[PDB]
Amino acid sequence: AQVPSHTVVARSMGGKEDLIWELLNQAQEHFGKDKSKEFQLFSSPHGKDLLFKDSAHGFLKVPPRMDAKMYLGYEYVTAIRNLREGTCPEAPTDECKPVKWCALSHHERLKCDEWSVNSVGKIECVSAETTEDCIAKIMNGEADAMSLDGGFVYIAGKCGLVPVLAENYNKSDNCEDTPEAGYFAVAVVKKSASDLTWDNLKGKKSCHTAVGRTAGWNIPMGLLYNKINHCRFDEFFSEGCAPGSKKDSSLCKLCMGSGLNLCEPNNKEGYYGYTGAFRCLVEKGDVAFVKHQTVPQNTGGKNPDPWAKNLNEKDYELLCLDGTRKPVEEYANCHLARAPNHAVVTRKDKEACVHKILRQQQHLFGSNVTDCSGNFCLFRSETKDLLFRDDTVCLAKLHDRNTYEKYLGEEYVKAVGNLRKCSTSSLLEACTFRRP
């Protein structure tokens, strides 16, 4: 079998990490690979394998997100734990243990617990606070599956998770078998600011869904990465609201949640998501980056919220990439790029059980259930997109395409790959240290 490297350990709180890495780095550059004939770091005459291996040839920094349980991987931790305890598992494939779905930040937990009781017991809820913690919680084993957009299905695909089911966003008599081509990503501006152009967005206020999402982050900032040639985007825009950013940027200086819940990438922030970014555009923004169906859901008096009842579907307008100004009703003229649908991800060994429990579960609580208040609906939520996106008709079966690079398609994977050197999420770094 293969094993991870030997490692230098340290304490969890007192550390100190930077001083060990400073010392071993400056030792590495002078004494490690035969730079000085006088002293050797990797050999000694009287004893061998002292203080280090003899077969080692250099040091690598462990990223700050990766702890021991992520360092060893899931298979090796399961091997050492079942070897130490001594179980030697049987695995009958008939029964299946219930699925530990992962939720986040108390607006997902209420609807998740209600779904755990409305189901007979097959679904149980374990939660986190940000989605990067919940992906790691799927990796370690405390969780089983969740629903992510393609920007995080890319990251969890790097960490070693596969997608099982996809979400359809168009109604049909046969939606469960028919694969969907994906939704569109648009930017929305107002009629009052008719001077705005895709050629010139500099110093204008931008509204994003969250850091790392497809229609909010990857598709716009990839094109802007081709134009600006800067990694930083707080310089091109004056202000804006992009949840999940660092606190020091102006991209958190326009957001609205308070206090200490500012730019938290969850439902505690008012400007999080698609609809929250639309509130960023209505209240304080100049441009928003959302999906193409954001304006018809929120406008027309469909939200019972006070901010959205007075909004009209006509006066907003969504701009193309050439510089033409074209209205909302035809999205097919003005789209930046095709974005793939949201998917349900899980580990490899729980692939079949999440498949069976979710198809069996969506037949009972799915889209045919009318009289939603007074009963339970899995997909219908209170306008905040809880556990799923509110326009999800059904979950399409994926056969022959269960891999992040297969499911996400070539153009979007290349589009994220042009933004590969620029992303600052620590979890992608921690999942990319594994690769030699």
Binding site: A1, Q2, V3, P4, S5, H6, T7, V8, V9, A10, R11, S12, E17, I20, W21, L24, K33, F52, K53, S55, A56, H57, G58, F59, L60, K61, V62, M66, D67, A68, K69, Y71, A79, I80, L83, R84, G86, C88, F433, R434, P436
Partner: protein, 87 residues
């Protein structure tokens, strides 16, 4: 190491190949004398040399491969390993 109350954490790993291609993993192998005349199935009751209790390529991979062939009781581990090997 990372169990309570120790609560340690890995901070600096190391690579084993050339500096062109750093290799983080390494391979676990089982080295024997020539022409001893036994495969992995005929391993029972032979004298064994382990590199340490709990280490990766010496204990966990060799015991974990042949582990479910031992007779009950499996607990504690090194007792039944001590019966499987003749010294």
């Amino acid at each position: 190491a990372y169990l309570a109350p120790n609560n340690l954490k890995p901070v600096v790993a190391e690579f084993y190949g050339s500096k062109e291609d750093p290799q983080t993993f390494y391979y676990a192998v089982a080295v024997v004398k020539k022409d001893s005349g036994f495969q992995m199935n005929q391993l029972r009751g032979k004298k064994s040399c382990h590199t340490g209790l709990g280490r990766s390529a010496g204990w966990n991979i060799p015991i974990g491969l042949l582990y479910c062939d031992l007779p009950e009781p499996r607990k504690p581990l090194e007792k039944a390993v001590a019966n499987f090997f003749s010294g």
